């Protein structure tokens, strides 16, 4: 019912209508997580190459 904050211009207009009232990880931590994942990849490839060496 109550029409507040009415602002007009050439492009258009905007308003608010109320009907009823109420009642981060750092760069060092990122580089660590990515490299810990690379160590697990390298280990799994090394265990594969060791198995194929046998």
């Amino acid at each position: 019912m109550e029409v507040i904050e009415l602002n007009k211009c050439t492009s258009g207009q905007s308003f608010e209508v109320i009907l009823k009232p109420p009642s981060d990880p750092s760069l060092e931590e990122i580089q660590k997580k990515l490299e810990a994942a690379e160590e697990r990849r390298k280990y799994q490839e090394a265990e594969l190459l060791k198995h194929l060496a046998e």
């Binding site: 207009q13 308003f15 109320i18 760069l27 990515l34 160590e39 697990r40 799994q44």
Partner: protein, 437 residues
């Protein structure tokens, strides 16, 4: 004037980026080469459109956009396509091999080699800004690059640009058009890693867009081009307030203020009307009351859910075309008495309204018809948690047997990260429950 940088990641992000930027160009009267005949201040300026376009001395208007894919094929079509002259080569970043539908391959393996290059190219656009306000990120939940690389980038942007706002345009996975069986894994994984780093996220369920295209546009089997042209119309409605003169949603901080009172519950539901077929002979033009009424039909929503069995935290109506305030208030009064609109007890039961007099621009030879008036409603309803429930259930079914998990572990990721991501999602589902009943 405060500039915005658009970031398009993966197939879905890039292709939607094509659609959005083609649309922005037609709206501001910018030609495929980059010239803007209506623009009088050559080589610079701080008009409302300059939020999305920078200017060269030659008179070219270049998007503040960066396209990144771990695979060359999709951006190669941008490089050679009708809008090749619009972007400068440095804005378009491509890898050798894609993430193969694998989050871990996108985030950890192939992500690590390209992350520093991307942030450097982002820095090149950011250093052209006199007052950067933040980023608009376009990506899929389901893709390997879209899920994996996006969440790594979102982490890094919080470090380099900590004081800035980050908005998401995300593609929720749908079996109808999906490319991968592991898309529920990718979706839960990216949501968990991105949740703290995103300020407002607009979810788009491919299922909803697909049915709208079948039902309203009479397209038998909708392609990505069909979906993207529609998605771009919705994106354009959301972004219009940044690109045009107005007093509602003028900056990215206002999106958080107007739509997101609870930082974690930052997924507003978009609803758009009307979607009318271009090759429909004789169409009775819909009034303000009719198109506002369509904003509360679930068949017009970007996510299929029932707002009646949930609570609202915020509501925006963004009109484009022949619309006056008096018509809007009359429509709101009628709708309130006929429908179930339940706000939370700690919020005003109200609507923030923005009208732009310029009627929606449609792509020539498109599937969409020219309309006298259109509307996009953005509402933060607890009902959108239904989409989380669906996705979490699909995740649980696969994870119980540890199906496909070995592909993720093989890229260096740990099995603990899966269940950590699932716990955060369980917490998110709980947040919506506390607020919503």
């Amino acid at each position: 004037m405060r500039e915005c940088i658009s970031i398009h990641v993966g197939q879905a992000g890039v292709q939607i980026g094509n659609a959005c930027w083609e649309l922005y160009c037609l709206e501001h009267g910018i030609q495929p080469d980059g010239q803007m005949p209506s623009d009088k201040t050559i080589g610079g300026g701080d008009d409302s459109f300059n939020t999305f376009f920078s200017e060269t001395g030659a008179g070219k208007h270049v998007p503040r956009a960066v396209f990144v894919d771990l695979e060359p094929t999709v951006i190669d079509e941008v490089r050679t396509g009708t809008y090749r002259q619009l972007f400068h080569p440095e804005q378009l970043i491509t890898g050798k091999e894609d993430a193969a539908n694998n989050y871990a391959r996108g985030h950890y393996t192939i992500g690590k080699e390209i992350i520093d290059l991307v942030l450097d190219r982002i820095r090149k656009l950011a250093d052209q800004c006199t007052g950067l306000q933040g980023f608009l990120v376009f990506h899929s939940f389901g893709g390997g690059t879209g899920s994996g690389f996006t969440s790594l980038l979102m982490e890094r942007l919080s470090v380099d640009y900590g004081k800035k706002s980050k908005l998401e345009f995300s593609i929720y996975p749908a079996p109808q058009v999906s490319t991968a069986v592991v898309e529920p894994y990718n979706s839960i994984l990216t949501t968990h890693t991105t949740l703290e780093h995103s300020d407002c996220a607009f979810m788009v369920d491919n299922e909803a867009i697909y049915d709208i295209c079948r039902r309203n546009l009479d397209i038998e089997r909708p392609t990505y081009t069909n979906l993207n042209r529609l998605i771009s119309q919705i994106v354009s409605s959301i972004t219009a307030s940044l690109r045009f003169d107005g007093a509602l949603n003028v900056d990215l901080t206002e999106f958080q203020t107007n739509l997101v009172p609870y930082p974690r519950i930052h997924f507003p539901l978009a609803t758009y009307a009307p979607v009318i077929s271009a090759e429909k002979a004789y169409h009775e033009q819909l009034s303000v009351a009719e198109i506002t009424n369509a904003c509360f039909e679930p068949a017009n929503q970007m996510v299929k859910c029932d707002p009646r069995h949930g609570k609202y935290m915020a509501c925006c109506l963004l009109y484009r075309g022949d619309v006056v305030p008096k018509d809007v208030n009359a429509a709101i009064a009628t709708i309130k008495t006929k429908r179930s609109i339940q706000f939370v007890d700690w919020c005003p039961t109200g609507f923030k309204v923005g009208i732009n007099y310029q009627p929606p621009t449609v792509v020539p030879g498109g599937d969409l018809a020219k309309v006298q008036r259109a509307v996009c409603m953005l509402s933060n309803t607890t009902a959108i948690a239904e989409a989380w429930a669906r996705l979490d259930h699909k995740f649980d079914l696969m994870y119980a047997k540890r199906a496909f998990v070995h592909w993720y572990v093989g890229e260096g990721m740990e099995e603990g990260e899966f269940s950590e991501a699932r716990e955060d999602m369980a917490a998110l589902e709980k947040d919506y429950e506390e607020v919503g009943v």
